[PDB]
Design a protein around this nucleic acid. Structure first.
Length: 87
DNA sequence: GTCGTTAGTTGTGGGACTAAAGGATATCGTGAACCGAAAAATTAGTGTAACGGGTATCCCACAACGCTAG
């Protein structure tokens, strides 16, 4: 059904002339947004060393395994509730 | 008399057909039933308040004299 719901681009005469188009402005804007996000993350990384060591390691682990309160709690010693509160 | 050769058809197949603009479509037919897969929702479990010195910072106010005698 899906493959029979798909037409052929040849049904439109000279489809390569007026269809299947893109604007590089969109690509440049997407890359600019990516750069903005990267700059924000670099700002956060630079702020990280100013925090307490335990809270810095909590975030560092949460950024390389990922908000895994259970596995972090067993790793740390604090419970699920305490570890979530500290995060 | 018989077999290979050459030239002239004859039928058949493959390949061309300005430039500029524009550029919307509609798209049937049906057989059953059970099992497996994974994606989603529902449920079960733990909780602070002030205190001793001692010291880092903040705001907030004030001071930072002048003269006389031994």
């Amino acid at each position: 059904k899906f493959h029979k719901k798909v037409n052929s681009l040849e049904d439109y005469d000279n489809y390569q002339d007026y269809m299947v188009g893109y604007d590089p402005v969109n690509d440049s804007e997407n890359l600019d947004e990516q750069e903005s996000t990267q700059k924000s993350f670099d700002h956060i990384k630079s702020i990280l060393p100013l925090l307490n060591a335990d809270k810095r390691h909590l975030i560092e682990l949460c950024l390389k395994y990922g908000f895994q309160y259970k596995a972090i709690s067993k790793v740390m010693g604090k419970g699920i509730h305490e570890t979530s509160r500290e995060i």
